[PDB]
């Protein structure tokens, strides 16, 4: 067996996933590789705020429907996001200056997207990139205008929109247990859960430099100590694609009982935003790279 999704499921995890979108599925060998080797897809761009709600209350789902329908057509799980973050955020939103207006805009955005696909989506990334590197909360428009309540409200709204989905907060630079940001998200998530915020998961966005895989072995169990039902690895790529870095990340998930799976940022190196760092698991000829084969070896029993 050569599918890393099949192999990780045979170790008891839920999926090995990949980010994609209509533009990828219509070209190259992406669809064929995803069908063969991955068990879950995420929309890279098509579910982000600027794509789905380019003006207030005016929604569009052309790309998102394409991806969701492709996943259902091909028997793949779906993760989607990000509902509330500063990236891909239209200026019409970040121009809002008052709490109630932004709350209602945010709630309508969450509810409309999640209701459209109710029951079909495994995981929603509800809040993203909410932390500064020092562990304080990032002064995005949601924090600046709503205040700290925005995170409780976002999660409570998402739970109502689709109670079947696993609701995640996600961030990057959570890759060392000694880094302030990693410690802060754990402390805040534990506080938020004790306050009744339904945070089901922490997702670690792992855009890694060479050699950073080893730190994840202790960072991931730190993240899991916040008490969420789940943790996951998102947006994974590694500059140089060292088998060692990738195997370390996989082993971290294997060693964390609440880690449900791993999502890689793309399929083939030339299509990565970081293509020249050759950071993915397939080369430009769509052949599996040494890191892919090292994952296969690590997961086979
Ligand atoms: O894991 N992912 O590659 C991924 C990509 C885009 C997203 N938007 N929200 N969550 C996401 C996860």
Curated annotation (Swiss-Prot):
Keywords noted in UniProt: Carbohydrate metabolism, Disulfide bond, Glycosidase, Hydrolase, Polysaccharide degradation, Pyrrolidone carboxylic acid, Signal, Xylan degradation
Annotated GO biological process: xylan catabolic process
Residues forming the catalytic site: 129 (proton donor), 235 (nucleophile)
Reactions catalysed: Endohydrolysis of (1->4)-beta-D-xylosidic linkages in xylans
The EC number(s) this enzyme carries: 3.2.1.8
InterPro entries: GH10, GH10_AS, GH10_dom, Glycoside_hydrolase_SF
Disulfide bonds: 253-259
Recorded GO MF terms: endo-1,4-beta-xylanase activity
Domain GH10: 1-298
Alphabetical list of Pfam families matching this protein: Glyco_hydro_10
Enzyme category, top tier: hydrolase
Highest taxon above the source species: Eukaryota
Family recorded in the similarity comment: Belongs to the glycosyl hydrolase 10 (cellulase F) family.
Annotated protein name in UniProt: Endo-1,4-beta-xylanase
Organism: Thermoascus aurantiacus
Organism placement in taxonomy: Eukaryota, Fungi, Dikarya, Ascomycota, Pezizomycotina
């Amino acid at each position: 067996a050569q599918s890393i999704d099949q192999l990780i499921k045979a170790r008891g995890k839920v999926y090995f996933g990949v980010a994609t979108d209509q533009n990828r599925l219509t070209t190259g060998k992406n669809a064929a590789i995803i069908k063969a080797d991955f068990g879950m897809v995420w929309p890279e761009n098509s579910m982000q705020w600027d794509a789905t709600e380019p003006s207030q209350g005016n929604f569009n789902f052309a790309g998102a429907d394409y991806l969701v329908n492709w996943a259902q057509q091909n028997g793949k799980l779906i993760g989607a996001g990000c509902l509330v973050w500063h990236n891909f955020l239209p200026s019409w939103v970040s121009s809002i200056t008052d709490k109630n207006t932004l709350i209602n805009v945010m709630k309508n955005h969450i509810t409309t997207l999640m209701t459209r696909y109710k029951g079909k989506i495994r995981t929603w990334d509800v809040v993203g990139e909410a932390f500064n590197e020092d562990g304080s909360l990032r002064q995005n428009v949601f924090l600046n205008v709503i205040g700290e309540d925005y995170i409780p409200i976002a999660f409570q709204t998402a739970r109502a929109a689709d109670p079947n989905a696993k609701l995640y907060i996600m961030d990057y630079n959570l890759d060392s247990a000694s880094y302030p940001k990693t410690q802060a998200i754990v402390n805040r998530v534990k506080q938020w859960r004790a306050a009744g915020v339904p945070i089901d998961g922490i997702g670690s966005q792992m855009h890694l430099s060479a050699g950073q895989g080893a730190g994840v072995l202790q960072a991931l169990p730190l993240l899991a100590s916040a008490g969420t039902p789940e943790v996951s690895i998102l947006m994974l790529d590694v500059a140089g694609a060292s088998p060692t870095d990738y195997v370390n990340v996989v082993n971290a998930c294997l060693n964390v009982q609440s880690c449900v799976g791993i999502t890689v940022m793309g399929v083939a190196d030339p299509d990565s935003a970081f293509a020249s760092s050759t950071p993915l698991l397939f080369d430009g000829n769509f052949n599996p790279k040494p890191a892919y084969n090292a994952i296969v070896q690590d997961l086979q029993q």
